[PDB]
Amino acid sequence: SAVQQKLAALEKSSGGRLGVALIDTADNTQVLYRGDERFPMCGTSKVMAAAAVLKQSETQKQLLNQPVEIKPADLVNYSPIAEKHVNGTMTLAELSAAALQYSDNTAMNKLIAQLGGPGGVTAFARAIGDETFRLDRTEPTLNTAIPGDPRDTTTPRAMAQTLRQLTLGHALGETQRAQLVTWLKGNTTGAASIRAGLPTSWTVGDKTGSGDYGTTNDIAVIWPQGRAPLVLVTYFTQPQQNAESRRDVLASAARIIAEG
Ligand SMILES: C=C1CS[C@H]([C@H](NC(=O)/C(=N/OC)c2csc(N)n2)C(=O)O)N=C1C(=O)O
Numbered sequence: 001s002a003v004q005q006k007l008a009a010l011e012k013s014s015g016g017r018l019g020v021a022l023i024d025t026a027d028n029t030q031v032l033y034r035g036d037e038r039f040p041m042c043g044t045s046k047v048m049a050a051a052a053v054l055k056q057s058e059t060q061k062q063l064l065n066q067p068v069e070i071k072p073a074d075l076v077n078y079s080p081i082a083e084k085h086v087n088g089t090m091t092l093a094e095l096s097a098a099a100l101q102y103s104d105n106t107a108m109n110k111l112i113a114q115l116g117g118p119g120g121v122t123a124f125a126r127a128i129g130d131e132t133f134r135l136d137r138t139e140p141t142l143n144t145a146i147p148g149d150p151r152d153t154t155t156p157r158a159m160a161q162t163l164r165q166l167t168l169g170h171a172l173g174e175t176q177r178a179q180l181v182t183w184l185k186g187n188t189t190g191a192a193s194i195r196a197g198l199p200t201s202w203t204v205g206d207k208t209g210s211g212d213y214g215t216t217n218d219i220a221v222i223w224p225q226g227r228a229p230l231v232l233v234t235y236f237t238q239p240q241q242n243a244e245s246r247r248d249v250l251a252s253a254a255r256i257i258a259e260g
Contacts, residue, residue, distance in 0.1 A: 003260035007033040007253060014249050016214065016238035021156035022257050023164050026228035030160075031257065038132075038153040039235035040145035042209030043103045044217045045121070045135055045152065049111040050096040050183065051166050052124035054176040056114070057092075064093035068110050075106050076140050082106035100183045100207055105139035112138055125162065128171040132158035143211030145237055156233045159219055164231045167205070167221045181205055184221065192247040193218035194234060197254030201225055214243025218250045232257060 011018040011033075020033040057063040067089035070082050081098035082090065083106075090098070090107075092114060099107035115121055118135040125133035135142065136151040143152075154162075165171040167181050184205025193216075195204050202224045209217035215237040222230040234250040 006256045010252050019156040019235035020253055021160035021233045023160050023231040035157040036155050040215050041154055042143045042211040044207050044209040044219045046099045046108050047207045049121045052115050053111055058173045065091050079104050079106035101187045103189050109139050130162045145211035145213045145215040160231045160233045163219050193250040194220040194254040196251035198258055214238035216245045
C-alpha cells in the first residue's frame with residue numbers, strides 16, 4: 001500500500017528499524033510495518049505492568065491505596081517521582097501514575113515486585129491472550145535493547161492488539177479500564193512522539209519508551225472527533241549502541257498513518 005511505501009521511505013531515510021501497527025476500530029482494519037518483528041519494549045512495557053496491578057485490584061478493592069516504601073536502595077536512574085518520596089511511601093495508584101506519566105523506573109520496579117517479579121507481568125499478558133509479550137528483567141536493565149535479544153520484547157501487531165483490549169476492550173473491568181485511560185491521557189513524556197504527528201483536535205493517551213541503540217518507542221490510543229478510535233504502536237531502534245533518540249521518526253510515522 002501507499003502508506004506502507006511512505007513508512008518504508010521514512011525508515012530508509014532514518015537509518016534504523018521501524019515497526020508500526022495501526023488498528024482502526026471503525027472496521028478492524030490494520031496497517032502493519034514489520035508488524036511481526038520483535039522490538040525492545042523499554043518503557044512501553046510499563047502499560048502491561050500497570051494494567052496487571054489494576055487487574056489485581058478488581059478483587060483486592062483497596063489495592064491501589066496500599067502504601068509502598070521507597071527506600072534509598074530502591075532508587076534507580078530516571079525516577080523523578082519516587083526520588084521525591086525517599087524514606088516515605090507512595091500508594092500503588094501513585095506508583096502506577098508515576099510509571100506511566102513520567103516513565104519513573106523505580107515506580108515500575110514497585111509494580112513488578114507487586115506482581116511477583118517480571119514473570120508476573122508476562123503472566124498477565126498471557127491471561128489476556130497476548131502470546132508474544134515477554135518481560136524478563138527489572139529496571140533499568142530491561143532497556144538494554146541489544147540487537148536480536150528476545151528479552152523484554154514484543155511485536156507491533158501484538159502490542160496494538162493488547163493496547164486495544166486494555167483500553168477499548170474488556171481485558172480489564174470497567175472502572176479499571178477508565179483509570180488506565182485517564183493515566184494514559186495524562187502522560188507528560190509524549191509531546192514529541194506520536195502526539196506531534198497528529199491533528200491537535202484528536203485526544204491521545206500514550207506511553208513512551210527509550211533505551212540504548214537509540215531505541216525510541218511510543219504506543220497510543222487515539223480518539224479523533226467524529227470517528228471511531230484508533231490504536232497505534234510505533235517502535236524504532238538503531239544500529240549504534242550510543243545512537244541519539246529519534247522521536248521525530250515516531251511523529252512522522254503517526255503523521256503518515258493519519259494521512260492514509
Ligand atoms: C523519559 C524516559 C527516559 S527513562 C524511561 C526508561 N528508559 C531508560 O531508563 C533508558 N533510557 O535510555 C534513553 C535506559 C535504561 S538502561 C538504558 N541503556 N537506557 C524507559 O524506557 O522506561 N523512559 C523514558 C521514556 O521514553 O518514556
